[PDB]
Design a protein around this nucleic acid. Structure first.
Ligand SMILES: [Mg+2]
Ligand SMILES: [Mg+2]
Ligand SMILES: [Mg+2]
Ligand SMILES: [Mg+2]
Ligand SMILES: [Mg+2]
Ligand SMILES: [Mg+2]
Ligand SMILES: [Mg+2]
Ligand SMILES: [Mg+2]
Ligand SMILES: [Mg+2]
Ligand SMILES: [Zn+2]
Lengths: 129, 199, 81, 209, 96
RNA sequence: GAAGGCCGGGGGCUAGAAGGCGAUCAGACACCACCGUAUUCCCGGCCGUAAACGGUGCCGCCCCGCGGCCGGCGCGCGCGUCCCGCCGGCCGCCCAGGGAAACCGGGAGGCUCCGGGCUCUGGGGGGAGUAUGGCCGCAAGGCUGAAACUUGAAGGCAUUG
RNA sequence: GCGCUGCUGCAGUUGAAACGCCCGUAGUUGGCCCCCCGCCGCCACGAGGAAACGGGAGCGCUCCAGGCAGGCCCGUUGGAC
């Protein structure tokens, strides 16, 4: 059965971007998907998107610009102590200069840079570069 | 802009008639299907494509760097006249593999643009061009595979008249764009030269 | 455009980007081509020697569809639209 | 006697029209003459090295026919590396063919910083992975002064390419030398083909060349 | 390794098929794996068909035919040249 | 839960383990020919194994192109069991991609750029699916399942002879 | 060393290895939706609680392994954390 909607959405996004398309459709929308896409947009990776209301698990349409290189999720959301982020950065990201790691905290969904700025920790959701 | 004379010439030339098969990458050029099943092209689309190809051709300053390849017996005459009037280079007959990668081949050249009449019959040269960063423009029928085909001209390419007519129109357009001739006066050359003659 | 600590670019060279897929073209991509299209005066029949340039990577060419991309790009850059 | 260009690019290089190798690489123009580089590399800035020499046999009606396969790498220690192989009935002729092939194929190497930026680049731009046969390689940027943590064979390639800090991991049958060298060569080759946020700048194309 | 994609038989959407007996050796073979040919022949060889027609008293008579379906096993077909061992590329050909 | 096998009753034509006999052979108690018991068939009940194979666990998402067949439904007209589609199923070829390769591409893809969920199995070759225990079964046997000792290779795909 | 015990991080068409198939309890995993209330997990901080070892501030046992010292006009000299 369907479990992780975000994983399906990200896989579809990468599949479409691989063959140089311009628009993708994701079926089951959700708040977490919307925040993930908002962060991606803010960092300049996927331009804009729209949500279509059908009264049943709204759909969503996104527009690409051939900048995204890889996106993914960590299924069992482990807890990241505020001082245990550099290990994950080294393990997951190509470099310490570019790339982002998404965490959910009591203060909301934020990039790992922001969490390092505020010296707090939380749970890991995904990553992209 | 398409004129009545041009459309009537194309219709008498049976240029808009294709084949029973269809490809998903050409459905945009298809306008209708006949009762038997033959597909019907769109004259405005092919005209716009011819104009675009003529522009691309005139972008090259030296006509000697353009290669015209055709293994079809019917095309030979049309390509020969096209190159003679445009002062380009022709590769009639069989295409020797290694003509573009083997520098020791007696007939070896470095073209900048390549022109083909049928990918199926001339696929050997298309790959060779793909090895050396050479764009290609080809004449594609209803069922064509556009692997490494930059520009596709939607036209018939089996009837002897259609082959000669398209080349004649292309030569006319390129010469006009070059400024040698004007649009209003009909070209002195008649299309019958490009069509192959029996016996 | 990898800047130094002083803002001085230290990249050897900036490679080209496909005009459709926005993808870097590698030094060894031998199926990568670049074309030009000529501009036409008001009277027609004449080129003004102003050309617009495009570049395409090998992957899109192999997969096809470069024709549709070229059509849309020309329409966006010209009156064909 | 004198070198007679057999190609348009060769003739242009004979003239002073082209002034640098990056002007060739940026258009993905193939190189077919060994002179196209030595004219750009006259001084002994580059260096050649023989990696491995293996003998291969072909059974026949009466005994075996033996031959030698050779592998050679070349680089200037400044963002340039090449790798080639050659086979011939004589060891020296195989070495010459391998050296010519290594010279023929060459790629630039992108170099970057680990964390802090200061001075010239010293390590690979990011993580680079390569594949050949069963062998996979990983190159992770390292801090300044960390040296090259790699096997003797791969370390020679890294030194020739001009990299002073890097962490390496090898997987698969690494005792097959040619496949490991090919994997590292491909990983290095991929460097100038990965898009980064610094390269997002949109530049208009130039009609000239 | 695997030599054929069909595994040497035409078996789709099923688990078992009825068996048949080879007409030369009487081996038991699956129906989908046996080599089958249909033949139509005159009861009388064409050499003496004219002679028989000359001798026949009936007017408007027609020579009757024989309709038989021959089934052979893999070993016997090769031995009797009903099928041949082909090259790797020719194995994909399905036309007579 | 194939076939064979067992228990208790029916039935008895073909074929045919065992057995007999004629040939072949140096030998032939085997291959070939002939006769022929159990069995092959039905009823009730045990056994619970097969190359029980697509040698590919189940649920779910995305995904090049061309084509054939089966079932159902809708559209169009010049009304043909025509052609344009949708869902489900069975197949063929195949660009990318993947792989040690053969090859797969309705995945064996989206994976060292290596995290969707659940269950089972494996850790060099023999000794050995053996010994000893336990459960099951009328039995034949099935499930579970070592150690000492020994050994430097055993295997897969492909190339030339 | 060994990503040959694999959470990070193995393999299961052909090399060793997907139960013959179905139902099914324990177990594990479970679409989307309400801005502010309660509880559980989670993150941060804090209190409380032996040192030695380990890290670490300062000091020229001639250096070092070490130790907690020394000169003078000493943070109340110091042995902080
Ligand atoms: Mg075999
Ligand atoms: Mg079966
Ligand atoms: Mg039975
Ligand atoms: Mg099995
Ligand atoms: Mg994995
Ligand atoms: Mg193992
Ligand atoms: Mg073992
Ligand atoms: Mg086996
Ligand atoms: Mg096995
Ligand atoms: Zn037979």
């Amino acid at each position: 059965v369907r479990i992780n909607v975000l994983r399906d959405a990200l896989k579809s996004i990468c599949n479409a971007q691989r063959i140089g398309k311009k628009q993708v459709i994701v079926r089951p929308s959700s708040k977490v998907i919307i925040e993930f896409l908002q962060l991606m947009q803010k960092n300049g990776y996927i331009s804009d998107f729209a949500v279509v209301d059908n009264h049943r698990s709204n759909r969503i349409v996104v527009n690409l610009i051939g900048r995204l290189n890889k996106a993914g999720v960590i299924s069992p959301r482990f807890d990241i102590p505020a001082n245990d982020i550099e290990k994950w950065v080294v393990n997951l990201l190509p470099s310490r200069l570019f790339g982002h790691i998404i965490l959910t905290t009591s203060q909301g969904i934020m990039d790992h840079i922001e969490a390092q700025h505020r010296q707090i920790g939380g749970k890991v959701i995904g990553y992209f570069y | 802009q398409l004129k009545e004379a041009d459309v009537k010439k194309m219709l008498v030339a049976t240029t808009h008639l294709g084949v029973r098969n269809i490809d998903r990458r050409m459905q945009f050029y298809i306008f209708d299907r006949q009762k038997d099943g033959t597909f019907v092209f769109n004259l405005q689309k092919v005209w716009a494509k011819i104009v675009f190809a003529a522009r691309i051709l005139v972008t090259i300053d030296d006509p000697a760097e353009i290669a015209v390849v055709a293994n079809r017996p019917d095309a030979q005459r049309a390509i020969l006249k096209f190159c003679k009037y445009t002062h380009a280079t022709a590769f009639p007959g069989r295409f020797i593999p290694g003509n573009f990668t083997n520098r020791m081949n007696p007939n070896y050249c470095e073209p900048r643009l390549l022109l083909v009449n049928d990918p199926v019959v001339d696929r050997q040269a298309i790959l060779e061009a793909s090895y050396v960063n050479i764009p290609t423009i080809s004449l594609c029928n209803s069922d064509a595979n556009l692997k490494f085909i930059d520009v596709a001209i939607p036209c018939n390419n089996k009837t002897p008249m259609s082959i000669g007519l398209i080349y004649w129109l292309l030569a006319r357009e390129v010469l006009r764009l070059k400024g040698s001739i004007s649009r209003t006066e009909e070209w002195d050359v008649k299309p019958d030269l490009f069509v192959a003659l029996p016996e | 455009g990898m800047k130094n600590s002083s803002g001085v670019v230290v990249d050897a060279y900036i490679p080209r980007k496909c005009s459709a897929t926005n993808r870097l073209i590698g030094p060894k991509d031998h199926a990568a081509v670049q074309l030009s299209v000529a501009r036409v005066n008001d009277k027609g029949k004449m080129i003004e020697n102003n050309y617009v340039t495009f570049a395409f990577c090998g992957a899109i060419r192999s997969r096809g569809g470069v024709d549709s991309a070229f059509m849309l790009l020309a329409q966006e850059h010209g009156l064909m639209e | 006697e004198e070198w007679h260009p057999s190609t348009k690019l060769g003739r242009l290089v004979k003239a002073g029209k082209i002034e640098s190798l990056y002007d060739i690489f940026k258009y993905s123009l193939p190189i077919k003459e060994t002179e196209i580089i030595d004219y750009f590399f006259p001084k002994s800035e580059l260096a050649e090295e023989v990696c491995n020499i293996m003998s291969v046999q072909k059974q026949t009606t009466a005994g075996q026919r033996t031959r030698f396969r050779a592998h050679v790498i070349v680089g200037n220690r400044d963002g340039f590396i090449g790798y080639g192989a050659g086979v011939s009935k004589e060891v020296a002729n195989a070495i010459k063919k391998a050296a010519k092939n290594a010279r023929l194929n060459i790629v630039p190497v992108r170099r970057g910083f680990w964390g802090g930026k200061l001075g010239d680049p010293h390590t690979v731009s990011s993580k680079l992975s390569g594949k050949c046969g069963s062998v996979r390689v990983r190159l992770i940027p390292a801090p300044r002064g960390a040296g090259i943590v790699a096997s003797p064979t791969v370390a020679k390639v890294l030194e020739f390419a001009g990299v002073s800090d890097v962490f390496t991991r090898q997987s698969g049958h690494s005792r097959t030398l040619m496949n490991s060298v090919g994997a590292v060569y491909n990983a290095l080759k991929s460097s100038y083909s990965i898009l980064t946020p610094d390269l997002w700048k949109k530049e208009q194309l130039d009609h000239v060349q | 390794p695997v030599k054929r994609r069909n595994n040497g038989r035409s078996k789709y959407n099923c688990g078992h098929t009825n068996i048949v007996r080879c007409q030369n050796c009487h081996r038991c073979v699956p129906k989908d794996k046996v080599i089958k040919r249909f033949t139509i022949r005159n009861i009388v060889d064409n050499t003496i068909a004219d002679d028989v027609l000359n001798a026949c008293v009936i007017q408007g008579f027609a020579i009757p035919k024989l309709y038989n379906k021959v089934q052979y096993c893999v070993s016997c077909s090769i031995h009797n040249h009903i099928v041949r061992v082909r090259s790797r590329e020719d194995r994909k050909i399905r036309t007579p």
